[PDB]
Amino acid sequence: KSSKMLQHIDYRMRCILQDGRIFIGTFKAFDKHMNLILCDCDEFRKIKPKNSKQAEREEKRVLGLVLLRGENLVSMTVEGPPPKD
Amino acid sequence: HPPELKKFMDKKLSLKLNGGRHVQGILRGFDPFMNLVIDECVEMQNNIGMVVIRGNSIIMLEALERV
Amino acid sequence: METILEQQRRYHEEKERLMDVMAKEMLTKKSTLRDQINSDHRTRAMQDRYMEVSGNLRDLYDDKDGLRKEELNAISGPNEFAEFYNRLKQIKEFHRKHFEELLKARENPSEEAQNLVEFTDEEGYGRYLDLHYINLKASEKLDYITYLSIFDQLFDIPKERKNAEYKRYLEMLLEYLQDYTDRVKPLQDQNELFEKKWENGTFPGWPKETSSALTHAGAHLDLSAFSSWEELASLGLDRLKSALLALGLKCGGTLEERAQRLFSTKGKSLESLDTSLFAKNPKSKGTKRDTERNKDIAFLEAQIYEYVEILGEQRHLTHENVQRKQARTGEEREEEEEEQISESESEDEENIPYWLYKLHGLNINYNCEICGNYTYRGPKAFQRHFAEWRHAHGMRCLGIPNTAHFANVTQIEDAVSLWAKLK
Amino acid sequence: GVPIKVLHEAEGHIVTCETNTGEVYRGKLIEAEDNMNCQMSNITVTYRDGRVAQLEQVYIRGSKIRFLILPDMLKNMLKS
Amino acid sequence: VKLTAELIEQAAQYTNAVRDRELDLRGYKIPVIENLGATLDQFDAIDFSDNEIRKLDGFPLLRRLKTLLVNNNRICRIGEGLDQALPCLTELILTNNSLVELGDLDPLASLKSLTYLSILRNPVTNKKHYRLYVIYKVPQVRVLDFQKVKLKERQEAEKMFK
Amino acid sequence: IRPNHTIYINNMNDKIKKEELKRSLYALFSQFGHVVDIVALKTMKMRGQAFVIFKELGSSTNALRQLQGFPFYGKPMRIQYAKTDSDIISKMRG
Amino acid sequence: SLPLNPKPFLNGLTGKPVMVKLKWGMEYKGYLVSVDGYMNMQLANTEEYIDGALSGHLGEVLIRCNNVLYIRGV
Amino acid sequence: EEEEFNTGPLSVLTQSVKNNTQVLINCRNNKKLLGRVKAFDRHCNMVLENVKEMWTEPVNKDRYISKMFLRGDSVIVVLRNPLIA
Amino acid sequence: MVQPINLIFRYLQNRSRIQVWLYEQVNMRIEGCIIGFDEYMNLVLDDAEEIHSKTKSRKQLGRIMLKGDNITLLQSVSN
Amino acid sequence: MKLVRFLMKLSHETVTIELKNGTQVHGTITGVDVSMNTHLKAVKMTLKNREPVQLETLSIRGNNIRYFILPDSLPLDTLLVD
RNA sequence: GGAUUUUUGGAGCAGGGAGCCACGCAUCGACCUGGUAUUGCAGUACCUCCAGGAACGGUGC
């Protein structure tokens, strides 16, 4: 089917980098190498929150429109549904 | 493909290599793998002459001239 | 030095200018205020609101004004927002800021640079103008907020506050429940819960995925709320809610049942016989632990609650939209999408070849020997070169006289014996 | 690749680049090759210690790039 | 000729001679510093020379701004919250402006990274003890008016004003 | 030596580090016009000297007359019009 | 010698005692049984020298090509 | 290709599958996997049976894994022996 | 223009003694006389040495084939 | 022969995968592709030195896999047939 | 379809101790006090020398 990536397209996605960073953005495009296009993308370092009572967000950075090279990608999970816009 | 480096031919350059290594010299040529020939090369300083840098280990280059 | 009188003066004057601007706005389209005020009504109950007739007929006194579209109303509301920001700033600095020999002393220095030929009509005009973009009439936005763009605040599916996009959260939710038994509409049915959201929870309120989701969603709803109602004092609302959170809970959990007694919000999720045991439970190690770990979540839950209440009309409006689009056909859904799109991207105020050079014979390597061993790229080019200034200069200055006998020349040598054959 | 076409689209725009070593280069993208080799100009570089520098002309190998930030001017390839 | 977003967007932008990103805002007759938000904190240097600014104030939070060239303007006062909007301000050139009283230079004490300061051709320069006053009140300065702040001057400024 | 876009400065305190010298030079000379570039080396030959290049020629002349003998890092600088045209100027002109 | 290339050199060294250094600093001495196109390597009666000291006597061994730093005849 | 699997260095794997013999795999993770080769490929991906994984942490450790797939890049060395015997 | 491969072909012909910078290992470099090489930049070095920049110590190797994987840089030495 | 083909047959199996970066992944395979890119559902993933997190879905770039621990039940001799 | 720019890996491993404060070894760099040389028309790894100071920065183990 080839769909396994195409399914998650347009969705908000949590992507894990090889150094251990967390990139969360809107998954808009990919390719053979898994180079990824991430709209409205932010970077997290310390945590991926599961409602951490102290705070959910530390070392968050707004990046914006991001192209990530697939070499440095480890994994991806669904973070939230597509924004309608 | 070739790397688009004709613009940088016979110019003095600053080369950042892996291992936190840095050298400076004049670009004398290249191939599709981005292996370089660098003349009058200097290890950052000690003069090492004309050398081959394997494109594999090239992080970044910066021109010390205007192209 | 600088006479504070002048500064404070300019301040009061600018404040006056701004008040006048946002008043002119409220004048052309009363909705701007009306809209705002109505919402305010349901947040601060005391607020007095105008006669309904005025609201409907879109009039302030006698004249009924033309109805404006949503995008413009919202725009001007955000513009007025920044205006009110400026005003608040100036008011602040002002609060922080508030002989004859010296008169002649300064009047003397005023003689400085007498030859200053220049017309100066730019103090009140540049301000009045600064708060009132195009050449004449193209963009309603004032020079003050000329780079203000709503589309960078609202997505297309929100339609400047008409709807709130919850599909995304339906996705995340599917990811949370680890199944697919949940439809967009069943998800909205879940949201409606927000006592229910407390005693009939979609999931266990101590579940991680769930609490995280709830956080993200809450944040969204709140930002949407204040986004769609710029004109209302955000800080006021925030503080109101916070105080309701602190004060309502403390005595009895604000949630009381004639049967089970007093419920604890978020941290413990247990009832209590009487207020007495309830109070002596708020110091126990258990409640300390919970209130110390699940505080942010409980508070966020609460916010989701009250903000969703304040937005009941938008929630309903969207749910409706969902059902509609859902009951559309293909063509219908497509045309509707077209409409939402147009509303989104609309002004807030309306008014060579090789196959030919090879065929022709050009771009082919060739050389003339007598001319600088020059290179020529075409064979047609050579005849032109022969009937040429420089080619004849090489011949004649070489001693080989011009014109038509020597035409076929290439090398310098042969035409020398040819010219010896001539003379 | 689809991302590659979008990269070439950013030629002539101001972009940010992080290397594999975490140095951060911001400036005008002159040329982007298919393999992600990047020629840029009038750069600001922010090292891992936080310090900044200024460079006129740079060229970074595609492999040794971790990522790039492109303008939002591009966001508006929605077909795929 | 208000300093506007539109003005900043068409302004010459380049890498200067000391290798920093600089924005050229020279000779526009700007009277008030405002709307800097639109530069997006992308400059290491901003050149405001030859304008009509009266007060060094009105800046948004600009984390990358390290050099401010403010030559030939009419600066007579320095804003009080400057470090809160310009934390890494390292060089401030105020040559040929209107600062007249030593006390008007007081707000520069709050710029923790300020190392290069130039106030030449300002009336304040001729005030008795002007140099020692600056040294004691703005000790973070290392070069004042293109002359090295030396230890002996620091000590001398410690006596007077102790 | 005719008026030139570039001025040649000598008699400068050579103890200042090169990058600091160039940055103070830039600061000082910005008052007269945009300085395009500054060439200063610490070799034996070139130490204590610098070439300051301005976009406008009037700026170079004004700088020369107004800062002649200006105390800079302790010494009075000596300014003069450069002998030749600066490479950057030649490239910007043609 | 008149040009002696990688491939023939290694082929000449088959049937011989070799030592291979790996990138990770381990060393393996044994008789080179064979090599392949990708320069994977097969040793017999292998011995392991770590820190240049005899560590383990291992027998027959495959070394994946990407691990190899260099090979020496010995 | 079979010839190169049969006679080349990979014959170590070819021989282990045919004889159902044990081999120790020194591994990139600093772990060693001791077991039988059910299948292998060019990259030295393997399907392994009766795997004893051994490592160190000083403290030695081990654990039994009946059935598993190894991606071949992690291979450092593969050892055949009088181990099975 | 000089192509990098050709430089090597030159090194080969010259029998200049060569010093190689290795990949991600700074404390050791390798030396030798290139006798031949292949399409992968794998080198056959004669009378080769490990050079410890930290210890100022040399390890004698003789006939070496160095995989090209490790090559960062190729330089010539007078010795 | 091409063992990725074997892995591609393991849809709807539950496995434990150990990653190159030490992370441990337990979930149900929805798909393995030719690059060994692996997709799962009902995933309990434990990064080295954390407590597990549960994800409804997770997608792994193939190269980042160290090894798969397969169900003891798995009938390998069946799956090795082409 | 495992040989330099992506998917058959250059990865792997090493930090507590002493009473909020302070820290082993090696290499390189500005760097800071004094004093001292040099007056020279350029396009730059770097740039006088002499003595003293480093509770300085970066990298590796």
Q: What is the secondary structure of F73-87 as a DSSP string?
A: TTEE-EEEE-SS--H
> For chain E, how many residues are written?
162
Instruction: Tell if the CB–CB gap between D68 and A64 is shorter than 8 Å.
Output: no
Q: What's the full length of chain I, in residues?
A: 79
Q: CA H56, CA H32: separation in Å to the nearest integer?
A: 10
Contact I32, I49 (CB under 8 A): yes
Enumerate residues 6+ apart whose C-beta is below 8 A from I3.
B29, B30, B31, B37
Q: Which residues of H28-56 are buried (b: 16+ CB within 10 A; e: fewer)?
A: ebebbbbbbbbbbbebbbbbbbebebeee
What would be the CATH architecture of the domain defined by G2-74?
A: Roll (2.30)
Instruction: Enter the resolution in angstroms.
Output: 3.2
- Return the DSSP state at C272: B
Q: HSE, CB side, 13 Å, CA atoms: give it for residue C14.
A: 23
Give the separation between CA F52 and CA F77, rounded to whole angstroms.
Answer: 13
Which structural domains are found in chain J, ordered by start?
Answer: 1-82 (2.30.30.100)
Give me the residue label for tokens 């470090």: E83
What's the domain range around D35?
1-80
The rounded distance, in Å, linking the Cα atoms of H25 and H35 is 8
In one letter, which amino acid is E34? Answer: E
Q: Is A50 exposed, middle or buried (0-12, 13-18, 19+ CB in 10 A)?
A: middle
Number of C-beta neighbours around residue C257 at 10 A: 13
Angstrom distance, H32 CA to K6 C1': 29
For residue G69 the two structure tokens come to 């730093």
**Beta-carbon count within 10 A of E81 CB:** 11
> What CATH number does the domain containing D41 carry?
2.30.30.100
Asked if residues E134 and E105 have their Cβ atoms less than 8 Å apart, the reply is yes
The helix/strand/coil state of H46 is strand
Chain centre to alpha carbon of residue C207: 35
Any chains having at least 3 CB pairs less than 8 A from chain B are D, I
User: Is residue C293 within 8 angstroms of chain A, CB to CB?
Assistant: yes
Closest CA to E7 of E48, E32, E35: E35
Asked if D64 contacts B58 with a C-beta cutoff of 8 angstroms, the reply is yes
**I10 neighbors B44 (Cβ within 8 angstroms):** no
Tokens coding C317: 């409006």
SS3 state at H35: strand
E12 DSSP β-pair partners: none
Cβ proximity of B39 and B25 under 8 Å: yes
Question: How would you classify the pairing of strands I71-77 and I57-66?
Answer: unpaired
Residue D66: closest CA among chain B residues belongs to which residue?
B59
CA atoms within 13 A on the CB side of C382: 20
Amino acid at G57: H
d(CA H40, CA H49): 12
Rounded Cα gap, residues J19 and J64, in angstroms: 6
G64/H7 CB distance under 8 A: no
Q: What is the spatial distance between Cα E136 and Cα E120, in angstroms, rounded to a whole number?
A: 18
Cβ of residue F82 lies below 7 Å from strand K? yes
The domain made up of I3-77 is a member of CATH 3.20.20.140: no
- H 19-78: CB within 7 Å of strand K: 28-30, 41-45, 71-74
**Total number of domains constituting chain E:** 1
Quick check: F60 and F3 in contact, CB under 8 A? yes
Q: K23 C1' – A59 CA distance, angstroms?
A: 30
Which CATH number is correct for B6-63, 3.40.50.620, 3.40.50.300, 3.40.30.10, 2.30.30.100?
A: 2.30.30.100
Residue of D19, D61, D67 to mutate, testing the A interface (most A Cβ within 10 Å of its Cβ):
D67
Residue at token pair 């940055």: F23
User: Cβ–Cβ of A84/C155 closer than 8 Å?
Assistant: yes
User: Cα–Cα distance between E134 and E141 in angstroms, integer?
Assistant: 9
B17 in Cβ contact with B32 (< 8 Å): no
Report the Cα D14 to chain-centroid distance in Å.
8
Alpha-carbon distance of E46 to E60, in angstroms, equals 13
**Domains located in chain F, CATH noted:** 1-94 (3.30.70.330)
Query: Cα torsion at C196, C200, C203, C204 (round to 10°)?
Result: 110
**Elucidation method:** cryo-EM
Query: Which residues from the 5-64 window of protein chain F have CB within 7 angstroms of nucleic acid chain K?
Result: 6, 8, 10-12, 14-15, 17-19, 22, 38-49, 51, 53
Task: Confirm whether any atom of chain K, the nucleic acid strand, is less than 7 Å from CB of A19.
Answer: no
Q: How many CB atoms neighbour CB D32 within 10 A? A: 22
CA separation for the pair I59, F92 (Å, rounded): 57
The helix/strand count (H/E) of chain F reads as: 3, 6
Where do the domains of chain A lie? 1-85
d(C-alpha A80, C-alpha J65), whole Å: 26
Residue reference for tokens 């009132």: C132
**Domain assignments of chain G as residue spans, ordered by start:** 2-74
> Chain C interface, mutation test: which of J39, J56, J57, most C Cβ atoms within 10 Å?
J56
CB pairs under 8 A between C and J: 13
User: Residues H70, H46: contact at Cβ < 8 Å?
Assistant: yes
Boundaries of domain holding E145: 1-162
Considering only CA atoms, which of C74, C95, C77 is closest in space to residue C85? Answer: C77
What are phi and psi for residue C386, nearest 5 degrees?
-60, -45
Q: Cβ(F37)–Cβ(F88) under 8 Å?
A: yes
Two tokens, residue J16: 């434990």
DSSP string, C89-133: HHHHHHHHH--HHHHHHHHTGGGSS---------SHHHHHHHT--
CA distance A11 to E160: 68
* Residue C143, SS3 per DSSP: helix
Q: How far apart are CA C360 and CA C352, in angstroms?
A: 13
Q: Residue B16 and residue D48: Cα distance in Å, rounded?
A: 15
Best of I65, I69, I70 to substitute, by most chain G Cβ atoms within 10 angstroms, is I65
Pairing of strands E67-69, E45-47: parallel
Bases in strand K with any atom closer than 7 Å to a protein CB = 1-13, 26, 30-34, 36-48, 57-60
Domains of chain H plus CATH, in order, are 1-85 (2.30.30.100)
Q: Which residue on chain A is closest to J65 by alpha carbon? A: A74
Nearest 10 degrees: CA dihedral of A19, A23, A29, A32?
10
User: Which contacts of I44-48 are long-range, i.e. CB under 8 A and separated by 24 or more positions?
Assistant: I44/G4, I44/G5, I44/G6, I44/G9, I45/I18
